Structure formats: structure tokens, C-alpha cells
């Protein structure tokens, strides 16, 4: 590469708030992230968040059935 024009790359440590640590290279030797590959919902299998729904709507109300036959 040309001298004088490029940001030098140093070995970097990138820490995610889930304690995950990733040995890489970067312009900064230490960056802290809030998400990563190890704790992302789409990554951690399904890790279906609060949307474990079933919907549950709406016939799955069943809130009743008391009405006569």
C-alpha cells in the first residue's frame, strides 16, 4: 500500500456487552459494541423474543364457550 495515505491497522479487541470478545484487526485497538453475532436474536437460533405469540388471536381466545348448544 501507499505510505502516508492509509490508516495503519493494529490488532484489535472488540467487546460486546454480552461479554463476547472477538480478536480481529481494526483502526482502533479496542472497540465496545452492544450487539454481536453471539447474542443477536436472529443468530441465537430462533431466540424468539417477546413474540412467542401463536398470535394468539383470535379463535384462540376461547374466552367463553359458555353460550348454549
Amino acid at each position: 500500500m501507499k505510505e502516508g495515505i492509509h490508516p495503519k491497522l493494529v490488532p484489535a479487541r472488540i467487546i460486546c456487552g454480552c461479554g463476547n470478545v472477538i480478536e480481529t484487526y481494526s483502526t482502533k485497538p479496542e472497540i465496545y459494541v452492544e450487539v454481536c453475532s453471539k447474542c443477536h436474536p436472529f443468530y441465537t437460533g430462533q431466540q424468539r423474543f417477546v413474540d412467542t405469540e401463536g398470535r394468539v388471536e383470535r379463535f384462540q381466545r376461547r374466552y367463553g364457550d359458555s353460550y348454549r348448544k
Binding site: 500500500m1 501507499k2 495515505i5 492509509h6 490508516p7 495503519k8 491497522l9 472488540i14 460486546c16 472477538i22 480478536e23 480481529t24 484487526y25 481494526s26 483502526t27 482502533k28 472497540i31 459494541v33 452492544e34 450487539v35 454481536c36 453475532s37 443477536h40 436472529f42 443468530y43
Partner: protein, 181 residues
């Protein structure tokens, strides 16, 4: 020629799975990563400013490589654009720089995408290359909200030696590309 964690994984983990999955007979038949070409199709910096110099400053902090200008092939009245204007930055990443970049793109950058529900399964070249587009540059770790001043996305081209889409799809997914559908 340094060790990159994702680079090992390609040789150690990805190469044999690909051979096992497609049955190549030659060590060079198996797909490889050729290059990653990152283009910011800015064009706001037509007559508004040399805003490029800030985008190059950040595209260089993201990839360690100083980008290079792109100029308008022709003039376009609607685009408020005259032939030759600086309308974008392109940086070509190869070898270790290419590996180091994807290693952070897949692990920490694609996760930071807001409402990220996987990469598009259809964005494949038809001939074994892949292209994704980003909406903003804070997704990358080296860029923060303080030193930023404008939302500029990009187009990312990953070029592979695979002749078919299926071969390329296997290569990326084995590397760690989270495909949606």
C-alpha cells in the same frame, strides 16, 4: 501474511465442507473469495460540498484502506450533475484486508443493523457473486455517533470464483452470512 480468525475458518472449516458438498477434484475448483468492492454512491457531494473527504475519512477507518473517487461518466440534467463531478468513493479490498473487513461485517456490523432479519437470499449475481446494500455507516464498529455527521450507506460487492449461485451461496453461508429466506 497474518492470521485472521475468519480466514482460518475458510481454510479449516469451509474448504472441506464445500468439497464434501460439491465433490470438486481440484484444489482450485473449490470457490474462493476474490475481492470485496465497497462503493458509496454518494452524489450529494456533487455541488453541495467536498463531503467526500469526510466519507473517505470514515470509509478508511472502516476498511483501513483509503478510498478513491468516482467521477460522472456523462452529464445528467435531472441529477443536477455535470460530467466529471466527484460523485462517489470506491475502495477495493483484497487478501488480508478483505478478510479483516468481512470478519467485522459478519460478526458485529450486520448484527448492529436495525431490525435485521437476515440477508436477502436472492441478491446473488446469477454467476456466483453477491451484493448487499447498507443504509448507514454506524453499523460498523469504528464509526460512532459523535464523529459522524450524516447518514451515508453503501453497496458491498463480494466476488467469488464460483461459477454458479449455489456454489456461492454455500461459500458465504459457511463463512457466516446470515441469510433470511
Amino acid at each position: 501474511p497474518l492470521d485472521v480468525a475468519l480466514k482460518r475458518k475458510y481454510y479449516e472449516e469451509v474448504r472441506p465442507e464445500l468439497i464434501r458438498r460439491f465433490g470438486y477434484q481440484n484444489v482450485w475448483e473449490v470457490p474462493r473469495l476474490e475481492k470485496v468492492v465497497i462503493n458509496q454512491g454518494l452524489g450529494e457531494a456533487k455541488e453541495d460540498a467536498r463531503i467526500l473527504e469526510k466519507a473517505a475519512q470514515e470509509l478508511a477507518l472502516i476498511t483501513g484502506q483509503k478510498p478513491a473517487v468516482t467521477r460522472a461518466k456523462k452529464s445528467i440534467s435531472n441529477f443536477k450533475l455535470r460530467k466529471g463531478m466527484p460523485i462517489g468513493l470506491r475502495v477495493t479490498l483484497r487478501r488480508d484486508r478483505m478478510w479483516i473487513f468481512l470478519e467485522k461485517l459478519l460478526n458485529v456490523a450486520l448484527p448492529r443493523i436495525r431490525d435485521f432479519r437476515g440477508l436477502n437470499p436472492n441478491s446473488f449475481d446469477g454467476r456466483g457473486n453477491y451484493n448487499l446494500g447498507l443504509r448507514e455507516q454506524l453499523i460498523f464498529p469504528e464509526i460512532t455517533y459523535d464523529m459522524v455527521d450524516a447518514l451515508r450507506g453503501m453497496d458491498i460487492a463480494v466476488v467469488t470464483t464460483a461459477e454458479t449461485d449455489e456454489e456461492a451461496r454455500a461459500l458465504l453461508e459457511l463463512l457466516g452470512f446470515p441469510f433470511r429466506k
